[PDB]
């Protein structure tokens, strides 16, 4: 937007923005200690947050780091997730706009499901013969937080948004915290560097990245292997990302992308998905939880409406009775 971006802390701390940040931070969390302790004097809280951010006296409270099974999930205080949400409402849409189309992570109107569809689509057309799928080792745990802030900084220009970004995410380490809206954004942005070594350099026009996973359909498995080598060398030397898994498969193994396995023709969810679901259902039955199963079923009936599962839905209706579709 003329590039620059040199006055974002004015928009981050607009009451009208911090109130959006507040409503976004609380959305879903309105049964949490953080919302409920904040909600008390919310607009008085947001007035001391607005004016913490508008001063450059905002300091991010320590991440409460638990872990679910194997992640490393660092939580934030509600005030801090609100500052993140108030950044990532101005700061996010000035990064998520540079995110090439085919980055499907944490950006509005692109998702898990618009990604698998992009891939199938782009696999459908192009008549892709082959594909490179890659993945970043411990991404959020290998994102430079330093060459990230050379991208959060070719686009923030506002020397106080920059210092708020650097409170909410320090500019030193190799640990973008996982479990930050601020960090979902800055990981898409960082992994956006490899998208601009696929699409820009490398002239790869058929790809999709969803945060750390990167499909790259080709036609010469030798070219896609090149692309991959070029992508890994880049993302290692420039972004400090080890590539955990990669492959250059013919489009036939199926692109295990984002939840689905995506052939040109059948985005066959994934067998993992079936068995996970089969098991989830079976468990739900023999847990007496056959009412949250309807919620789950309705969920998985969406992940599988596009994937091909008529017979599988008949099969699951015959095994347990439950209304799949």
């Amino acid at each position: 937007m003329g590039k620059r971006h040199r006055n974002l802390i004015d928009q981050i701390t607009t009451w009208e923005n911090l109130l959006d940040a507040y409503r976004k931070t609380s959305h879903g969390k309105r049964r949490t200690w953080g919302y409920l302790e904040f909600k008390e004097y919310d607009l008085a809280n947001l007035l001391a947050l607005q004016a913490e951010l508008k001063a450059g006296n905002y300091e991010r409270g320590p991440y409460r780091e638990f872990l679910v099974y194997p992640r490393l999930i660092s939580a934030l205080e509600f005030k801090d997730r609100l500052v993140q949400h108030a950044l990532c409402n101005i700061v996010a849409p000035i990064f998520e706009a540079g995110l090439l189309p085919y980055t499907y992570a944490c950006r509005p109107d692109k998702g898990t499901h618009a990604g698998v569809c992009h891939v199938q689509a782009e696999l459908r057309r192009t008549r892709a013969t082959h594909f490179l799928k890659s993945d970043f080792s411990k991404f959020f745990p290998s994102i430079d937080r330093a060459a990230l802030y050379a991208m959060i900084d070719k686009k923030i220009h506002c020397a106080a948004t920059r210092r708020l970004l650097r409170v909410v995410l320090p500019d030193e380490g190799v640990g973008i915290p996982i479990g930050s809206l601020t960090s979902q954004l800055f990981a898409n942005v960082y992994g956006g560097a490899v998208d601009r070594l696929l699409h820009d350099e490398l002239k790869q026009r058929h790809w999709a990245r969803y945060m750390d996973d990167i499909v790259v359909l080709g036609d010469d498995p030798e070219e896609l292997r090149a692309v991959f080598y070029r992508l890994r060398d880049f993302a290692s030397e420039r972004l400090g990302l080890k590539i955990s898994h990669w492959q250059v498969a013919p489009v036939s193994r199926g692109i295990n992308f984002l939840g689905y396995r995506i052939w040109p023709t059948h985005k066959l969810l994934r067998k993992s998905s079936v068995k996970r679901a089969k098991r989830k259902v079976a468990n739900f039955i023999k847990h007496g939880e056959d009412e949250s199963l309807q919620r789950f079923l309705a969920s998985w009936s969406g992940h599988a409406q596009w994937a091909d599962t008529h017979n599988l839905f008949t099969w699951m209706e015959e095994q347990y009775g439950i209304a799949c579709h």
């Binding site: 200690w33 302790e37 909600k39 004097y41």
Partner: protein
Amino acid sequence: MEPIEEATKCYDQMLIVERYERVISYLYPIAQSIPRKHGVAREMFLKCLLGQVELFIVAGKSNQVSKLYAADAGLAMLRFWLRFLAGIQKPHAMTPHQVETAQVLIAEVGRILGSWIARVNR
């Protein structure tokens, strides 16, 4: 910044009130509909609806299980008011759907009150 602290933070009181605010936010519109007449029933319903928040709140701050049971009695009285506003109020006051919706919300506040009563009872 650290949000403006109230004293005696009862996660349970804070949560129950936020969930009961949804009961109020559902019921207050339909209480402020109980016709011009039925105004005493409405004022008494509204004093039961909007005044259950104080019952929860005082239960939260005065960590005394008596005040938590008084909050439960009020939720029970609010459930009565749903019964009453549906059945006994003659124009309509509350459509059967509205009682079904409100009872779900009051049930959510009932759950939280129950959990809160239990955690205090231990």
